[PDB]
Amino acid sequence: GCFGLKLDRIGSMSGLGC
Amino acid sequence: EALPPQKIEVLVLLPQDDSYLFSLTRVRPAIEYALRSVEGRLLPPGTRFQVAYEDSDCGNRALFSLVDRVAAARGAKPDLILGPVCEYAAAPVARLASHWDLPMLSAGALAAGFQHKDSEYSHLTRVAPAYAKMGEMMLALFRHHHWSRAALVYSDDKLERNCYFTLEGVHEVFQEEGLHTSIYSFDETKDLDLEDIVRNIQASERVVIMCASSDTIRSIMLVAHRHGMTSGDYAFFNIELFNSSSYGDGSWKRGDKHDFEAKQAYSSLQTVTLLRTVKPEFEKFSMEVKSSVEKQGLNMEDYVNMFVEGFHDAILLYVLALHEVLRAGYSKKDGGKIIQQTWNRTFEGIAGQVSIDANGDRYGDFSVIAMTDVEAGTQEVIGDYFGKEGRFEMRP
Amino acid sequence: ALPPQKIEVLVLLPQDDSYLFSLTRVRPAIEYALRSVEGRLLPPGTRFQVAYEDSDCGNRALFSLVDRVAAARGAKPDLILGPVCEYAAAPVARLASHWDLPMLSAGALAAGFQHKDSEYSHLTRVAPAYAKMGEMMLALFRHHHWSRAALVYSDDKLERNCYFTLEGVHEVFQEEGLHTSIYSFDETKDLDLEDIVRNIQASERVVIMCASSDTIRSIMLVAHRHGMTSGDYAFFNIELFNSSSYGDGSWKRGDKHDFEAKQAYSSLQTVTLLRTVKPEFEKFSMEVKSSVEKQGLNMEDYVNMFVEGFHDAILLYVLALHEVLRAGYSKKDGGKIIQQTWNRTFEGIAGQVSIDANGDRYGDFSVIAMTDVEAGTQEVIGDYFGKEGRFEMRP
Ligand SMILES: *[C@@H]1O[C@H](CO)[C@@H](O[C@@H]2O[C@H](CO)[C@@H](O)[C@H](O)[C@H]2NC(C)=O)[C@H](O)[C@H]1NC(C)=O
Ligand SMILES: *[C@@H]1O[C@H](CO)[C@@H](O)[C@H](O)[C@H]1NC(C)=O
Ligand SMILES: *[C@H]1O[C@H](CO)[C@@H](O)[C@H](O)[C@H]1NC(C)=O
Ligand SMILES: *[C@H]1O[C@H](CO)[C@@H](O)[C@H](O)[C@H]1NC(C)=O
Ligand SMILES: [Cl-]
Ligand SMILES: [Cl-]
Numbered sequence: 185g186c187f188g189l190k191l192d193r194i195g196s197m198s199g200l201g202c
Numbered sequence: 203e204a205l206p207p208q209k210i211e212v213l214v215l216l217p218q219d220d221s222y223l224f225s226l227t228r229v230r231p232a233i234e235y236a237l238r239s240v241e242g243r244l245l246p247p248g249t250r251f252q253v254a255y256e257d258s259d260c261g262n263r264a265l266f267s268l269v270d271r272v273a274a275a276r277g278a279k280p281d282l283i284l285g286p287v288c289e290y291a292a293a294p295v296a297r298l299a300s301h302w303d304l305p306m307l308s309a310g311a312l313a314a315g316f317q318h319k320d321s322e323y324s325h326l327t328r329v330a331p332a333y334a335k336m337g338e339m340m341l342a343l344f345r346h347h348h349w350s351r352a353a354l355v356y357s358d359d360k361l362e363r364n365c366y367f368t369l370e371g372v373h374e375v376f377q378e379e380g381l382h383t384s385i386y387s388f389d390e391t392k393d394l395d396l397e398d399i400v401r402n403i404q405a406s407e408r409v410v411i412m413c414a415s416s417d418t419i420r421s422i423m424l425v426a427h428r429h430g431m432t433s434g435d436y437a438f439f440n441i442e443l444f445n446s447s448s449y450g451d452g453s454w455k456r457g458d459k460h461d462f463e464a465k466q467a468y469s470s471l472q473t474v475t476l477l478r479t480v481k482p483e484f485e486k487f488s489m490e491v492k493s494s495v496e497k498q499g500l501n502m503e504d505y506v507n508m509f510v511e512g513f514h515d516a517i518l519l520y521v522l523a524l525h526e527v528l529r530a531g532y533s534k535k536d537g538g539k540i541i542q543q544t545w546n547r548t549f550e551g552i553a554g555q556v557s558i559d560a561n562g563d564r565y566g567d568f569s570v571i572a573m574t575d576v577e578a579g580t581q582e583v584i585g586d587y588f589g590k591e592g593r594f595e596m597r598p
Numbered sequence: 599a600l601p602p603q604k605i606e607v608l609v610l611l612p613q614d615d616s617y618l619f620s621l622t623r624v625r626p627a628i629e630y631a632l633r634s635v636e637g638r639l640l641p642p643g644t645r646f647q648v649a650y651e652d653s654d655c656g657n658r659a660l661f662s663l664v665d666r667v668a669a670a671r672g673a674k675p676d677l678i679l680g681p682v683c684e685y686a687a688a689p690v691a692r693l694a695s696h697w698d699l700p701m702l703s704a705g706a707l708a709a710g711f712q713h714k715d716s717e718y719s720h721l722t723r724v725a726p727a728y729a730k731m732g733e734m735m736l737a738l739f740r741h742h743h744w745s746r747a748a749l750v751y752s753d754d755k756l757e758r759n760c761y762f763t764l765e766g767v768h769e770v771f772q773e774e775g776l777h778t779s780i781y782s783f784d785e786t787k788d789l790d791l792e793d794i795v796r797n798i799q800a801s802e803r804v805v806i807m808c809a810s811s812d813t814i815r816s817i818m819l820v821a822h823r824h825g826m827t828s829g830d831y832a833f834f835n836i837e838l839f840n841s842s843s844y845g846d847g848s849w850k851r852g853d854k855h856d857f858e859a860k861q862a863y864s865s866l867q868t869v870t871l872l873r874t875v876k877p878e879f880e881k882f883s884m885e886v887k888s889s890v891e892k893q894g895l896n897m898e899d900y901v902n903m904f905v906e907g908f909h910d911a912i913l914l915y916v917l918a919l920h921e922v923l924r925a926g927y928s929k930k931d932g933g934k935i936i937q938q939t940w941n942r943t944f945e946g947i948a949g950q951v952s953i954d955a956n957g958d959r960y961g962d963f964s965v966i967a968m969t970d971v972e973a974g975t976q977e978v979i980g981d982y983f984g985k986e987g988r989f990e991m992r993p
Contacts, residue, residue, distance in 0.1 A: 185373070185383065185384075185385035186358070186366075186385050186387055187354075187369075187370055187373040187374075187377075187383075187385060188377075188755075189314075189373070189374050189377050189378070190753075190755035190784070191315075191755045192314075192315040192318055192755070193315070193685050193755065193756070194289075194293075194313065194315055195289070195290055195293030195294065195315070196290075196293065196294060196685055196688035196689050196692075197684065197685065197688045197708065197710045198290075198360055198361070198710055199708055199709045199710040199762075199765055200360065200709065200765070200768075200769065201765060201768055201780070202358075202387075262692050262696070262717060265689075265692070265693075266692075266693070266696045269664055269667070269668055269693070272664075272668040273667055273668035273672060276670040277668060277669050277670035277672070294660070294689055297657050297660065297661075298660070298661070298664065301657070301661045322657065
């Protein structure tokens with residue numbers, strides 16, 4: 185699951201693969 | 203004892219590109235309508251609004267412009283920032299607004315991350331329903347049916363990622379509550395292997411929550427239809443919060459050579475969207491906005507989208523809060539106080555009541571669209587969820 | 599012919615000495631370089647004014663750059679050094695590019711900073727980025743005829759060092775067509791070692807891992823109990839910067855588990871940076887160690903890659919500023935300055951340093967393995983030289 189109630193910092197970048 | 207006239211400077215950060223529902227030309231008419239509505243009263247008489255409309259480019263540009271304006275103005279900062287709407291555009295602007303103690307209202311920034319306002323996103327007030335609000339509604343829908351597992355299937359751009367953030371709203375809530383979710387993402391702008399998608403769905407769950415373009419969903423449904431997945435074995439849901447008016451007439455319809463199959467396929471699909479209320483005021487509001495946008499060279503929904511409605515209400519909410527902070531003996535520069543005043547309260551917006559929760563996030567009301575008559579291919583709303591009340595109810 | 603140059607430098611690094619690249623550890627390195635510089639490629643009289651600001655390995659780096667520039671009394675620095683932390687660096691790099699200001703860092707190692715067509719056009723990375731480590735792993739795999747791997751790392755969702763580290767491997771491998779199984783966990787939470795090891799047991803025989811050294815010792819211990827050490831699996835961990843972690847005897851803790859750990863580590867290989875030394879480096883180290891101790895702190899013996907790279911950052915800037923001033927441009931032509939720092943080889947205080955055609959330092963790596971299990975002795979077994987692109991085992 186590419187999710188997981190985390191990664192709030194989803195901003196200022198993207199790269200690849202979660 | 204009327205206070206001295208105010209000179210409120212607002213910075214609007216939205217896209218110039220009209221490809222977006224929240225582009226500047228589309229939203230400006232609504233902001234102007236609300237300002238027209240406020241000056242005749244809550245602010246000191248003689249108060250004026252100076253609004254700068256700046257291209258956010260749904261990206262880094264928003265931040266660049268904010269910074270460049272402050273520096274050019276030798277350190278002077280706007281009194282109110284409206285937007286950005288785009289998640290990646292909004293996060294840096296929100297961070298700076300919190301750092302500079304400036305109030306920031308947006309009908310966007312719907313991603314889960316903006317929920318944590320202890321520090322980084324203090325100062326951000328969201329005027330439209332965040333994705334977690336749609337998530338809470340899905341939880342209630344699931345509790346209603348006693349469903350406890352779901353396959354989340356969505357398109358992930360790795361760019362604007364709207365559907366990824368949408369389903370994150372569901373994932374977050376479901377994880378909190380302990381429901382199981384299978385996750386399957388793909389990039390709908392690349393070549394699609396429709397059969398790998400459908401095969402993963404049949405190996406994982408029977409209740410599927412999807413988010414992708416209306417055409418990608420149609421393709422997936424047509425392929426599920428050939429695999430015999432559209433006659434009751436699965437319950438499909440797709441999320442179309444901002445443009446779901448095609449229903450009633452037929453969201454499956456495309457004047458295509460796949461139209462009949464699509465209509466059958468869609469009998470197993472339910473669509474989640476925003477519950478939108480109306481008043482004569484809202485009706486007039488739409489007409490004027492629509493006219494302005496029309497002679498501007500753009501087409502437009504018949505009832506202005508939520509972003510447009512949201513931003514109209516964002517001005518009423520700002521003025522409401524500013525009026526109270528002013529009367530309390532503070533200034534427009536006390537952004538934190540202005541922001542806190544916009545939270546935990548209900549006020550009258552252009553389409554009805556608007557309630558912002560205690561975390562500064564608007565409660566959302568949602569509707570579920572289902573095919574009520576498979577022969578005709580008729581789609582209607584079968585149930586609603588009222589966020590503040592936190593209750594889901596099938597319609598009689 | 600040319601007047602004194604006054605270059606304003608903004609250094610954005612963590613105040614917290616918990617980081618290997620905190621202000622206290624790196625400042626001495628920049629100063630040392632500054633002396634060497636001010637005494638000559640630049641017009642005499644030329645002097646650098648350096649502001650050391652806390653990046654807090656986060657949002658503060660952005661807030662400081664902006665407060666300094668957009669203040670009424672503000673102005674744009676001529677050179678920005680750091681941030682190192684990936685999320686702290688992304689915003690600063692975007693701004694540096696928007697304002698045509700040159701930005702050099704020994705950090706910003708993530709794959710996303712690779713694409714410099716737009717947003718990150720003004721960033722040159724002086725230390726090897728994770729993709730460079732990924733290129734080394736690809737060469738190591740080719741050497742063994744390995745074509746599949748399990749990537750197992752800790753992802754704390756905050757600084758995410760190990761996530762960005764294995765992303766370097768993932769990118770290169772996918773590009774090349776090698777298959778990778780992905781397994782992440784938050785080492786900051788209670789570990790489900792049984793699940794970790796069972797997931798590995800079922801995926802691949804070659805496991806590439808990144809997590810704190812104590813997290814790795816634990817995995818290895820459980821794998822040991824499951825009989826996975828001793829041959830059936832080839833384990834790798836990544837310890838590029840911390841010398842206490844890639845030093846001989848990485849299995850030892852003076853623990854009640856030290857014996858089991860030594861045996862388990864017989865199947866573990868460690869990837870780290872291939873560092874070099876020369877007379878000058880020793881002086882630099884001695885001098886750096888002097889300031890740092892005088893600043894009340896326990897040193898890490900010889901200085902890490904961040905300290906070294908930031909010293910070389912200054913030197914590379916000066917070389918670029920020279921050839922740019924010559925061509926008749928000013929220190930304000932950030933774009934021009936950065937282009938000059940790319941695609942060139944110069945002499946750093948540890949030896950030659952080559953920056954590739956995309957503004958990224960070429961990286962050399964070594965693989966450390968246990969060459970004597972009774973003793974638990976770990977030595978370098980092979981090296982990879984990035985620029986030549988050759989992996990070679992040692993005699
Ligand atoms: C370098 O790595 C060492 C490990 O070899 C780190 O030391 C550990 O630090 C953690 C967290 O403080 C402790 O729980 C461990 O007990 C320490 N282990 C040992 C043997 O010291 C050290 O923190 C790292 N140094 C830096 C500055 O990053
Ligand atoms: C980079 O510079 C080298 C000389 O240092 C030169 O041989 C090479 O052509 C350059 N690479 C390009 C074409 O960008
Ligand atoms: C919005 O989407 C609907 C279908 O989902 C489409 O009919 C309409 O033209 C679109 N208009 C917008 C939002 O630009
Ligand atoms: C809204 O919630 C707050 C808690 O944050 C509560 O104290 C308050 O009574 C509620 N609204 C009001 C002021 O009536
Ligand atoms: Cl936007
Ligand atoms: Cl940093």
